[PDB]
């Protein structure tokens, strides 16, 4: 009988705590809106050496990892990119980079088509930008680079403890926009598990098959080209798992997911219960958001 009292307490206690939490949040969000009245800036002087891509540049003498200007083809106008000239003989053109959650990756079809984020930032003191930022090169560009000739893909990651693993792909291609940036990969190898081809390692049959990326079309929260035949507009993969990706139904890997600080996260934190967040199931499961996640390419020899 005397339960109603202790109940009206715990209820009054929490509703007033949440009231405070709300106060903190409106504070934080209001402060950020103000800092956003002006932008962040960089000053990246351009390296002289240039080429069709990073592989040509390293062969031309550019032996340091920094922002470089490349021109895949006379048609396209020269554009900035970050070149990894140290990992595995260098010559790696960075097409995707995650490392601090500084950039938003849940964007529409057009931003993903054109590219977004920060290619590079200043190396503390220097006049050039020897450090990479968080970015997505841009589907039109990625498609054109891979279609220039055989291209290999190198995906890298790191947990919040400092452990690193990688998924290599000897063959990688992405069709143009008219083909929904369809993806194709093969000749895998590495320590992270082939999640793009085989799918969720810890899954069986149909369940593991619907998480295979190879062969999928690109989808953004405003453009559903997923392998999920739903009738409910809220049931698209991109809307659920975060950013733009070659979502099937839905994924085994989510390189462009939301950046969770700390790594560990759970369904009660996820905006939709789904497993958004920089995921690579085959290595740390579905509820771990990597600290570092990047995708790079290079002509294949």
């Amino acid at each position: 009988n005397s339960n109603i009292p202790t109940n009206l307490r715990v209820l009054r206690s929490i509703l007033e705590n949440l009231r405070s939490k709300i106060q903190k949040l409106e504070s934080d969000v209001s402060a950020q809106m103000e800092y956003c009245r002006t932008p962040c800036t960089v000053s990246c002087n351009i390296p002289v050496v240039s080429g069709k891509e990073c592989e040509e540049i390293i062969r031309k003498g550019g032996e340091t990892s920094e922002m470089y200007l490349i021109q895949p083809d006379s048609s396209v106008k020269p554009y900035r990119v970050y070149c990894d000239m140290n990992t595995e003989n260098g010559g790696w053109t960075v097409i995707q980079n995650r490392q601090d959650g500084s950039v938003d990756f849940g964007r529409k079809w057009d931003p993903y088509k054109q590219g977004f984020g920060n290619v590079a930032t200043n190396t503390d003191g220097k006049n050039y930008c020897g450090l990479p930022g968080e970015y997505w090169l841009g589907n039109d560009k990625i498609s054109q680079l891979t279609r220039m000739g055989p291209t290999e893909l190198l995906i890298e990651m790191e947990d919040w403890k400092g452990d690193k693993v990688k998924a290599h792909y000897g063959g990688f291609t992405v069709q143009n926009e008219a083909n929904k940036y369809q993806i194709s990969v093969n000749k895998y190898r590495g320590t992270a598990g082939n999640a793009l081809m085989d799918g969720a390692s810890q899954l069986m049959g149909e369940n593991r098959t619907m998480t295979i990326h190879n062969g999928m079309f690109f989808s953004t929260y405003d453009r559903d080209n997923d392998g999920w035949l739903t009738s409910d507009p809220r049931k698209q993969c991109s809307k659920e798992d975060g950013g733009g990706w070659w979502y099937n139904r839905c994924h085994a890997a989510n390189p462009n997911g939301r950046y969770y600080w700390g790594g560990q996260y759970t369904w009660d934190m996820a905006k939709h219960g789904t497993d958004d967040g920089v995921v690579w199931m085959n290595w740390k499961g579905s509820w771990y958001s990597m600290r570092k996640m990047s995708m790079k390419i290079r002509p294949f020899f």
Partner: peptide, 4 residues
């Protein structure tokens, strides 16, 4: 993650 799947959608079985």
């Amino acid at each position: 993650g799947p959608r079985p």
